[PDB]
Amino acid sequence: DDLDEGIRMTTYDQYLSHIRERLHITNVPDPIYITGASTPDQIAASVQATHVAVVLYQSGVINGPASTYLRENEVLVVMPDYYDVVSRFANANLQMNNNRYHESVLEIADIFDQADFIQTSDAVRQLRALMPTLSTSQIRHAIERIAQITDVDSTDYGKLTLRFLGTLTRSLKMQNAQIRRIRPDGTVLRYDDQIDIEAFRWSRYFLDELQLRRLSVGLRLITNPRIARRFNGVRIMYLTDDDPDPDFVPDVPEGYVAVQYAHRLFSSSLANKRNRVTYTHPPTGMAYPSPTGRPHVHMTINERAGMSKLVADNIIASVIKSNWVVDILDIEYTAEVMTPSEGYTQHVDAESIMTAPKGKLFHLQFMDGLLRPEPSAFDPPASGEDMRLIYPLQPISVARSMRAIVNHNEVDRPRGAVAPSSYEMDTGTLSRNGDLLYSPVANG
Amino acid sequence: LSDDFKQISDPKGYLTYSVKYEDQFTKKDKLRASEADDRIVGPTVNLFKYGAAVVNIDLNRDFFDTATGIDLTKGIPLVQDLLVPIGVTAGAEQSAEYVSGLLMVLFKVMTDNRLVIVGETTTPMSNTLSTVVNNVLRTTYHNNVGVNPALLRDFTQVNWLNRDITNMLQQAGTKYGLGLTETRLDYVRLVKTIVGH
Amino acid sequence: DDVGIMQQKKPPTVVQSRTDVFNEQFANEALHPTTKVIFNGLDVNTEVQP
């Protein structure tokens, strides 16, 4: 089975936030619950009734014909929770497994056929995933800040200004909010075209149509890989500076052994009248007081936060003397790509990479040494060796359109030279409706 | 009238090419374009000049200005004091600034109410242009042509680049074009006729 | 492909000066490429041949 293939399913909270109000607004019966005695024909009648291909799950183990129907028709089951999901399905083949699934964003547009009530896409979810979880006051701070940037006097917004109670702030959070009539009890009523005006039907995130149209293009821009120039993680490996390409990531050598960093791996210990920072290899169990003579380790450091200066220094010393590879994942960095004539203006000692606060943004520099000209035949030999420690874990030249605009010889291309993508030049046409289009590839 | 838009000529984009040069490289031969072809192809040739070490595609700092709060001196948009800790000053060079940058970028795009009006435009006679340029040109074009690597064709003195760009431009699936074009909206009026460039 | 005539920019050149005995430490090691070299007097190729 392809990762795309299987039984689509989502948590009830997602259904409530995103699918349910839309169903309410389209005047269709609420989707049927699926007990263990649900025929595929019933699910079909439900799906054609709601025009949505969604069924809530109620209770019991679902029979296999229903499962094959749900799978063949890509129907989205809604679940109370993700505990013991396999227990909810009959397994004629026992192929289903709690660990065998593929989490992925599924745009509402792939479900609903009515474009009128769908303003965004997956891009907003991705952008939100970038955001730290915010307390309501942090949300208010964000909104007040954006208001400050756009020269709005946001004073008293979101606040009750009482004569005797003073000012009181209420939460500005109201994600997915809709305008709705309430019964005098205070409880919400479902939208009714008969009494409520059409404008209150769906709120469109309280944005102007044109603002939405533009918001779409902006979302495409924001999630473009070229703009995604904030990188996570740095491999630390003691190697000679051979490769011109900035985006070089040394491979871990064949003999190396992966080891997650943990405080427990390092200890004080006696060794030849010294209290050396012994390291114990998790496989062999062997203790190694000296940074020299340690087994080839590919150590991963997900979080530096508790690490002692002694241990960090010992890890670096192992990188250098025992030839460790240490992938530090906690690091986030911008990455300027220097050209050989401009050198490295900024420097990062190993200590600072190992001790910088989490959540601070490092600014690494990486030479593109492809434009270094050949040495003279009579330049004195270098007895020494230029070395390098820091490397990216991911491609860094994401913004790079072209490279090495010079001739090797007069006619040959320099190795690693980069032509502009054809797409940068395609300037096709306007669509029938005015959207930009690339030229047709094949004539048909 | 309500000022719903921001009429402007010669629009600036969200993305622009940035370029780093190694100045020690310089072709010995001096290419001699016609004055017209230099009027069109010039800003391109000048920017992707021989010796360009890298050519990046950055968000246009001129558009995502400090007035939006965005800083772009690094690889990424960065906006201070948007996503912050409460009860303490936010640390300098905090990573969350990147996310704020994206928000302010998204927002700034969401609110771009620019409405292009045609700027000054030349209409070269065909004979005044090299044929390769003339095939791309469509009668008129803005005097402020931006840059495009497609213009480098038969103009860059770098051989492999010319060969590669010529390949992509001779593919059926990609056709560079510049200047006034036959839009579906041609001859539609709105106090003034709409046209495509 | 051609030989550089202008003075090229070079990585910083730390001279390690190893002796019979020493205490190696790698705190504040540089991360950028660096030319560690062992001897102080490496300008040995003096006699230019016209």
């Binding site: - | 402007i8 090419y17 009006i117 | 920019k9």
Partner: peptide, 26 residues
């Protein structure tokens, strides 16, 4: 002479639209 490096980036020119009083067509 020392080898050197230098950058460039395409300039903005997005002026507000000119207010002409001449007209092209009858």
């Amino acid at each position: 002479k020392i080898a050197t490096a230098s950058s460039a980036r395409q300039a903005d020119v997005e002026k507000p639209a000119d207010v002409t009083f001449t007209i092209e067509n009858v």
